[PDB]
Write a protein that binds this DNA or RNA. Structure first.
Ligand SMILES: [Mg+2]
Ligand SMILES: [Mg+2]
Ligand SMILES: [Mg+2]
Ligand SMILES: [Mg+2]
Ligand SMILES: [Mg+2]
Ligand SMILES: [Mg+2]
Ligand SMILES: [Mg+2]
Ligand SMILES: [Mg+2]
Ligand SMILES: [Mg+2]
Ligand SMILES: [Mg+2]
Ligand SMILES: [Mg+2]
Ligand SMILES: [Mg+2]
Ligand SMILES: [Mg+2]
Ligand SMILES: [Mg+2]
Ligand SMILES: [Mg+2]
Ligand SMILES: [Mg+2]
Ligand SMILES: [Mg+2]
Ligand SMILES: [Mg+2]
Ligand SMILES: [Mg+2]
Ligand SMILES: [Mg+2]
Ligand SMILES: [Mg+2]
Ligand SMILES: [Mg+2]
Ligand SMILES: [Mg+2]
Ligand SMILES: [Mg+2]
Ligand SMILES: [Mg+2]
Ligand SMILES: [Mg+2]
Ligand SMILES: [Mg+2]
Ligand SMILES: [Mg+2]
Ligand SMILES: [Mg+2]
Ligand SMILES: [Mg+2]
Ligand SMILES: [Mg+2]
Ligand SMILES: [Mg+2]
Ligand SMILES: [Mg+2]
Ligand SMILES: [Mg+2]
Ligand SMILES: [Mg+2]
Ligand SMILES: [Mg+2]
Ligand SMILES: [Mg+2]
Ligand SMILES: [Mg+2]
Ligand SMILES: [Mg+2]
Ligand SMILES: [Mg+2]
Ligand SMILES: [Mg+2]
Ligand SMILES: [Mg+2]
Ligand SMILES: [Mg+2]
Ligand SMILES: [Mg+2]
Ligand SMILES: [Mg+2]
Ligand SMILES: [Mg+2]
Ligand SMILES: [Mg+2]
Ligand SMILES: [Mg+2]
Ligand SMILES: [Mg+2]
Ligand SMILES: [Mg+2]
Ligand SMILES: [Mg+2]
Ligand SMILES: [Zn+2]
Lengths: 100, 100, 115, 151, 83, 127, 211, 224
RNA sequence: CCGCACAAGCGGUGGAGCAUGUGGUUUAAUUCGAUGCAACGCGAAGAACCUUACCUGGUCUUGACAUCCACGGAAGUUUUCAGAGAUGAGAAUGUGCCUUCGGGAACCGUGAGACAGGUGCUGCAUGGCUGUCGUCAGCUCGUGUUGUGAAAUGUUGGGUUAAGUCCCGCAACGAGCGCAACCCUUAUCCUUUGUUGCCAGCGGUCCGGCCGGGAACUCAAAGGAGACUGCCAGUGAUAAACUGGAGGAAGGUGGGGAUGACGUCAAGUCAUCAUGGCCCUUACGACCAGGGCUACACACGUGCUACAAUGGCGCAUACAAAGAGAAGCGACCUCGCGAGAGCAAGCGGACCUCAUAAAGUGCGUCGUAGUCCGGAUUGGAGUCUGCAACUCGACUCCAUGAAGUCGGAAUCGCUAGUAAUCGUGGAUCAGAAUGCCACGGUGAAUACGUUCCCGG
């Protein structure tokens, strides 16, 4: 992927770290079963002012070696292509062709 | 109390077997009685990825990681045995959890 | 008998016969019978007029038949003249809940028309 | 089957009457792998024929079988590059198979608001040689007799 | 449908724009991109230019439109028919 | 005085313990009519004792795990066969000739890539 | 058609892994990235040190890198300086205490990675490919390889139409899993693009499997 | 061998007058019952001359190849070589065995490797099916090359039974200059045999008499 | 002469509704690619934003990402205003490191260039990777021989095999790559170890393997044993082999996988990556908001649900396997008709959770009807995830109750635990499966044959 895409990914994964606690407590206030309506309303209005990139659901798992956004595997952090070419080289511990 | 329970995980059974063998050997030469390694069910984590970089999907391969478990219970540990264990560095491929 | 209007329930089991009436479904029918105290499997025949009258009075709780049809027509018209997107798709006779129209939209577009 | 001819797979005898014939029958009207669903229809439609249609259910099965069995069947085979409807003889076991396969197809069109009722009705009617099932056998025979010119 | 617990959603900038408008009664179209905001009762009688992605459609707000999203009254796709 | 046999069918394991007695059968702490709703399963379970003509001379304590009721009935039949031939040891020819020591190894075939099911293939799109 | 990667299909049969550590899902992708970066840096450093392979064994509190190389004096250096230097920087990227071990491929003419890089280094000095292939093959066969297969793929000699040319001596049974097939792939970025080089070397069948 | 010794064995017997070769006229006594009769008077000096050359070759460490592929006579040809410690071909002759010595040497090496491997071990390491398959391959090689496993190099002399049947062998020998000693029936072409013995070859008893005399003469040469 | 190629069978597709992909058309854009078999539930193992490459508009110019230098400041941290946001303007703090007191480091800002950047073109410049013929049985070579020689022989012939498998024959003898075997898994047994798994014999049981205990059995997972035409009979050329039989859990490569020869298609991919060349560089690079990839007269492919009594509905009650889980799976309990909510145990897991399998069986009902079949579509009202469900999510509840009464020509899959049918799980993933990948339950019919079609 383009270098700018990887830069976007690292920026998003860093911005979602310096806002995790504030976002957590704001979301706690909003979805509180018993809370003041005005306090819940202000939590809702404050949750928007944070950078939109600070929400963990805007990150996209990209392959670490290339940045491929499709075919990613969490167990390895690599797309289906790099997983295979590392596996065949014996680079992934324990991985091995399967038959049964 | 006086009871140790160690669990060994590996990706190769030919390594975990010798790990267990030497651990019970050490625990035995101090006179502690141990349950010989209990083979717990091995986990087979299966992945299936597309060999073709583009267009083909029917063509794909299947990899597998088999993690092997062993359990060793030491029922009456002499306090020399507890430290005599930690003087055992197992092969890099093995993971040890020691509960008491 | 005319429990909810001109339409008449069949002589079959009461729960099914009540469903035949517009605005009444199998759930509503079970609720109507429970309030009346009538069982679900008794037929409309073998049922006394007082019983059928309490059936009518329980049916009167819900909006059924014409008073409901008019209500659903008005709900549709509200959207249609409100100018909202869903009203637009109502007026063009296309799926209004986001289904695809590249294909499989026949129950709203109707039969296929060649070129 | 081009090099070695395996032939039909062997089947276990019917559990209730220890008869392969009836076992093949339940296998031939079983739908979607529903063995018990089919044999619960079979055994009822045979019990009903036991008490009223005849004296014995298992023997009534045969008296309906040979009452619908065909003998000469046109198996269209081009001998030398011409469409020839050559008539050939059916083997005994394939004869029983064709017979039961036709009787189940007859019971399917019966209706009668049940499945046991249909099977009983048509198995009887065929045992008397007056069933929707026997007509297909005599039509096989009609088509065999028409095409005698190719022997 | 947004949860009743959460309550109706509205973009903060649009809320403040609408307050500042309904205060002085500018009655001037509000150039907004917030198609995802709900129409609140205090927006009745305003004209809001909602972005359709190429331009700003002037939606004049009535009370029937309360409880609806701004984006619902602005069409995004253009279909004049195949023929 | 207790004879044991293990029987496996279609991923079902059945431990069978046979002893001289009334002829009662108990499968997983339940009678034969309670455990198997079908009748074909019942006659499968009873086939060996029928064949060897020892139906009232043995009490059967059976437990079975895995598979389905039809598969379990086959596993119980294989276990009973083994326990019988471990009891008398001359019944082996009679049981084998009846095919009860077959231990049929048919098992479910795995699904394969590019196939909807093993030996099943997507439609060819007319060409 | 296409062949299975001959090293990958023998993993755990006769070939061992290049990485030997256990990790759960939380640390697995991290460890893979760290191994990747370690290998990348070590290749970029010892390109001229004729490294053959890099195996990586991670104890719970540390990392250990073994470097199978052909000229150990170059990489160990004068008084073990550069190697020690290496340790520092790999301990920097693995973010964990490190340790470097050096192993010598006594016969560089029988290790597929070194043969491949030799051929590509010659192809980048404009040695004609047929000479490189033939002399690699016979140098391997001299030293007791049961069989060797070399294959150069690409615009050979700069020709506009690319073509693959291979050459095999002796016996290279690829379908036998019992066999000890050492296979590695290299590539030369010549003035006209990439030329691929694959090389299989058969050292005889292994009995007793891994042992 | 004396003329009486041959005649009782039937050495004079031959093929039918219908089936003879032109160059054999000098060696043919005549015909009886449409059967060619071989003249023992011609045969006895030529057989003695062949024995004298074979004894001389044997005395100087001569390796002798007894050759015969007759189904019935194959065991006798093998036995004669075994008695005098020599090499033989009793199974069907392989084309270019002498000319393609290298390929035959590779086959001999493969036979030696398989037998050595079975004695050494590793059959247990091989799968039981593989070990049985290796034994079958060893047996097939042992039947085909058992006689010449220990020949080491190209032989110094050849003894051939029914030279017409084994014509490829004699063509090879002449191409190599290796001398040919052969029992030549009337139907054979005698050009390829440098020391030609005209006599029956079909009868096992006649072949045994020639083989026994040659084996004893070779043994006398070894004893010196 | 072989192959689900046909025949013999069983079930489909083609008709209906919907899901999905493609063409076409439309559009500001509907991003790019894949196109007879061998593209069309394909790249994509998961487009609301992000992804995102596309369009509209707003913005930047050594730059979002790298090194180099110079200048100025620790870095970081808290809040205000303007703006859709990008950004712009501001307000609230430091002193850790050696300090040869010079300064350098971590970082941030700024200026100038060398450069960065490109999912820009070419897969007819390429590497790598893949499809396909085809898991078809072939493709070759050394030496010998034959021929004036191109070449041939081996590799053909007789048989026989799944097989260039094997034997005999034969100027061929051998070998290499294939074939088979070595690998995984499945079926039987034995040895070893017994918890979190097991409960036969026992003691009590709150009747729960629960608790003393037991190591037998199931099971777990490591090491072994076993099948080889080995044994017998017949056929066959005293051959290979074939047919049958015994024994045996297994019988004739037992079942299934992995494994894809030399090559073919200038096949696919420059958009994973890498890469020769060309091209852009205050723009074809970069940032942001909103829209689009989801359009809709239509055509095609692949699927799902059906059209029903072998069934629908209600009630009661059985029997699985394989998996996943730490920002995770989340019990019990309470609240809610329900999706769910609250509270909160346990579990990095043979322990805890996901998680009750469903077809099945028993009882009752329905009575062949556009129905108590079917569930499309639409209305009203909700729950959850998420900054955010208008375009454009899933799900629940109430109501609505289309087409459909088994589908023309034509065409597809399948030879056994297979087809058919029934559920369960996983990857991707905040959420979003009728796809894909896997798992078990129930469980067939038929194969006379090799004339024809199809490919070798
Ligand atoms: Mg790049
Ligand atoms: Mg996402
Ligand atoms: Mg687990
Ligand atoms: Mg409803
Ligand atoms: Mg949708
Ligand atoms: Mg709604
Ligand atoms: Mg299945
Ligand atoms: Mg057909
Ligand atoms: Mg259509
Ligand atoms: Mg259709
Ligand atoms: Mg288009
Ligand atoms: Mg497209
Ligand atoms: Mg597909
Ligand atoms: Mg612009
Ligand atoms: Mg503002
Ligand atoms: Mg400075
Ligand atoms: Mg600057
Ligand atoms: Mg550049
Ligand atoms: Mg190409
Ligand atoms: Mg193209
Ligand atoms: Mg094959
Ligand atoms: Mg052939
Ligand atoms: Mg050929
Ligand atoms: Mg040739
Ligand atoms: Mg042949
Ligand atoms: Mg071969
Ligand atoms: Mg030949
Ligand atoms: Mg007790
Ligand atoms: Mg034990
Ligand atoms: Mg084992
Ligand atoms: Mg075998
Ligand atoms: Mg014979
Ligand atoms: Mg038998
Ligand atoms: Mg047999
Ligand atoms: Mg096998
Ligand atoms: Mg193979
Ligand atoms: Mg492949
Ligand atoms: Mg092309
Ligand atoms: Mg392109
Ligand atoms: Mg641009
Ligand atoms: Mg955007
Ligand atoms: Mg799309
Ligand atoms: Mg219904
Ligand atoms: Mg999951
Ligand atoms: Mg409740
Ligand atoms: Mg679940
Ligand atoms: Mg039921
Ligand atoms: Mg109609
Ligand atoms: Mg399914
Ligand atoms: Mg998800
Ligand atoms: Mg043809
Ligand atoms: Zn002769």
């Amino acid at each position: 992927a383009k270098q700018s895409m990887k830069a976007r990914e690292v920026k998003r994964v860093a911005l979602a770290d310096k806002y995790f606690a504030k976002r957590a407590e704001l979301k706690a206030i909003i979805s509180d079963v018993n809370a003041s309506d005005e306090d819940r309303w202000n939590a809702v209005l404050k949750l928007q002012t944070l950078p939109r990139d600070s929400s963990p659901s805007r990150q996209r798992n990209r392959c670490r070696q290339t940045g491929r956004p499709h075919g990613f595997l969490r167990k390895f952090g690599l797309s289906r292509i790099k997983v295979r070419e590392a596996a065949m080289r014996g680079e992934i511990p324990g991985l091995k062709k399967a038959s049964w | 109390n006086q009871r140790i329970r160690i669990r060994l995980k590996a990706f190769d059974h030919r390594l975990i077997d010798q790990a267990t063998a030497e651990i019970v050997e050490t625990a035995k030469r101090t006179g502690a009685q141990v349950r010989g390694p209990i083979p717990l069910p091995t986990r087979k984590e299966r992945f299936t990825v597309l060999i073709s970089p583009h267009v083909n999907k029917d063509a794909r391969d299947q990899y597998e990681i088999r993690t092997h478990l062993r359990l060793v219970d030491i029922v009456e540990p002499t306090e020399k045995t507890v430290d005599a264990l930690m003087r055992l560095d197992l092969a890099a491929g093995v993971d040890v959890q020691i509960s008491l | 008998a005319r429990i909810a209007g001109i339409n008449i329930p069949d002589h079959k089991h009461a729960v099914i016969a009540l469903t035949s009436i517009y605005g009444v479904g199998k759930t509503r029918s079970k609720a109507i019978l429970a309030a009346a105290g009538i069982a679900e499997d008794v037929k409309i025949s073998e049922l006394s007029e007082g019983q059928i009258d309490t059936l009518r009075d329980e049916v009167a709780k819900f909006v059924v038949e014409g008073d409901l049809r008019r209500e659903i027509s008005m709900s549709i018209k509200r959207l249609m003249d409100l100018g909202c997107y869903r009203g637009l798709r109502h007026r063009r006779g296309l799926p209004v809940r986001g289904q695809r129209t590249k294909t499989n939209a026949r129950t709203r577009k109707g039969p296929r028309k060649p070129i | 089957p081009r090099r070695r001819v395996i032939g039909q797979r062997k089947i276990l005898p019917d559990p209730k009457f220890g008869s392969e014939l009836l076992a093949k029958f339940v296998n031939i009207l079983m739908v979607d792998g529903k063995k018990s669903t089919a044999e619960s229809i079979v055994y009822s439609a045979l019990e009903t024929l036991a008490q009223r249609s005849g004296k014995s259910e298992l023997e009534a099965f045969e008296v309906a079988l040979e009452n619908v069995r065909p003998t000469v069947e046109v198996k269209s085979r081009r001998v030398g590059g011409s469409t020839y409807q050559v008539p050939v003889e059916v083997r005994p076991v394939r004869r029983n198979a064709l017979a039961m396969r036709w009787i189940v197809e007859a019971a399917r069109k019966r209706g009668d608001k049940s499945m046991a009722l249909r099977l009983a009705n048509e198995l009887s009617d065929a045992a008397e040689n007056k069933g929707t099932a026997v007509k297909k056998r005599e039509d096989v025979h009609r088509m065999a007799e028409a095409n005698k010119a190719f022997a | 449908p947004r949860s009743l617990k959460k309550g109706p959603f509205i973009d903060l900038h649009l809320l403040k724009k609408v307050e500042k408008a309904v205060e002085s009664g500018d009655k001037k179209p509000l150039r907004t991109w917030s198609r995802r905001s709900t129409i609140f009762p205090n927006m009745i009688g305003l004209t809001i230019a909602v972005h359709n992605g190429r331009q700003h459609v002037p939606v004049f707000v009535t009370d029937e439109m309360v409880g609806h999203k701004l984006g619902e009254f602005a069409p995004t796709r253009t279909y004049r028919g195949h023929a | 005085n207790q004879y044991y046999g293990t029987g496996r069918r279609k991923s079902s394991a059945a431990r069978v313990f046979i002893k001289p007695g009334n002829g009662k059968i108990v499968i997983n702490q339940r009678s034969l009519e309670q455990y198997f709703g079908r009748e074909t399963a019942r006659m499968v379970v009873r086939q060996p004792l029928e064949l060897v003509d020892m139906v009232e001379k043995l009490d059967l304590y059976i437990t079975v795990k895995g598979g389905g009721i039809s598969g379990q009935a086959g596993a119980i039949r294989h276990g009973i066969t083994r326990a019988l031939m471990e009891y008398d040891e001359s019944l082996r020819s009679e049981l084998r000739k009846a095919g009860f020591v077959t231990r049929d190894a048919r098992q479910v075939e795995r699904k394969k890539v590019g196939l909807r099911k093993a030996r099943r293939r997507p439609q060819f799109s007319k060409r | 058609g296409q062949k299975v990667h001959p090293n990958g299909i023998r993993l755990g049969i006769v070939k061992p892994w290049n990485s030997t550590w256990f990790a759960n899902t939380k640390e697995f992708a991290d460890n893979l990235d760290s191994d990747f970066k370690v290998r990348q840096y070590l290749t970029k450093e010892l390109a001229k040190a004729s490294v053959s392979r890099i195996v990586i064994e991670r104890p719970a509190k540390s990392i250990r890198v073994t470097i199978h190389t052909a000229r150990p004096g170059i990489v160990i250096g004068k008084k073990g300086e550069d190697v020690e230097k290496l340790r520092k920087v790999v301990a920097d990227i693995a973010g964990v205490p490190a340790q470097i071990n050096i192993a010598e491929v006594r016969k560089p003419e029988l290790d597929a990675k070194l043969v491949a890089d030799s051929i590509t280094s010659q192809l980048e000095r404009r040695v004609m490919f047929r000479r490189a292939m033939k002399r690699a093959v016979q140098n391997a066969m001299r030293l007791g390889a049961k069989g060797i297969k070399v294959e150069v793929s690409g615009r050979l000699g700069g020709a506009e139409i690319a073509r693959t040319e291979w050459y095999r001596e002796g016996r290279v049974p690829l379908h036998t899993l019992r066999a000890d097939i050492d296979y590695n792939t290299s590539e030369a970025h010549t003035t006209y693009g990439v030329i691929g080089v694959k090389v299989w070397i058969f050292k005889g069948e292994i009995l007793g499997g891994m042992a | 061998v004396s003329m009486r010794d041959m005649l009782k064995a039937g050495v004079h017997f031959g093929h039918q007058t219908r089936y003879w070769n032109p160059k054999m006229k000098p060696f043919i006594f005549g015909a009886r019952n449409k059967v060619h009769i071989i003249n023992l008077e011609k045969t006895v000096p030529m057989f003695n001359e062949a024995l004298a050359e074979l004894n001389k070759i044997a005395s100087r460490k001569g390796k002798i190849l007894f050759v015969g592929t007759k189904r019935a006579a194959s065991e006798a040809v093998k036995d004669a070589a075994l008695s005098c410690d020599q090499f033989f071909v009793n199974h069907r002759w392989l084309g270019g065995m002498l000319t393609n010595w290298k390929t035959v040497r590779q086959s001999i090496k493969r036979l030696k490797d398989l037998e050595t491997q079975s004695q050494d071990g590793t059959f247990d390491k091989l799968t039981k099916k593989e070990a049985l398959m290796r034994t079958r391959e060893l047996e097939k090689l042992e039947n085909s090359l058992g006689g010449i496993k220990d020949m080491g190099g190209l032989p110094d002399a050849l003894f051939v039974i029914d030279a017409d049947h084994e014509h490829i062998a004699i063509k090879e020998a002449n191409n190599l200059g290796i001398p040919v000693f052969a029992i030549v029936d009337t139907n054979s072409d005698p050009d390829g045999v440098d020391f030609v013995i005209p006599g029956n070859d079909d009868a096992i008893r006649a072949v045994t008499l020639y083989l026994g005399a040659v084996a004893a003469t070779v043994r006398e040469g070894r004893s010196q």
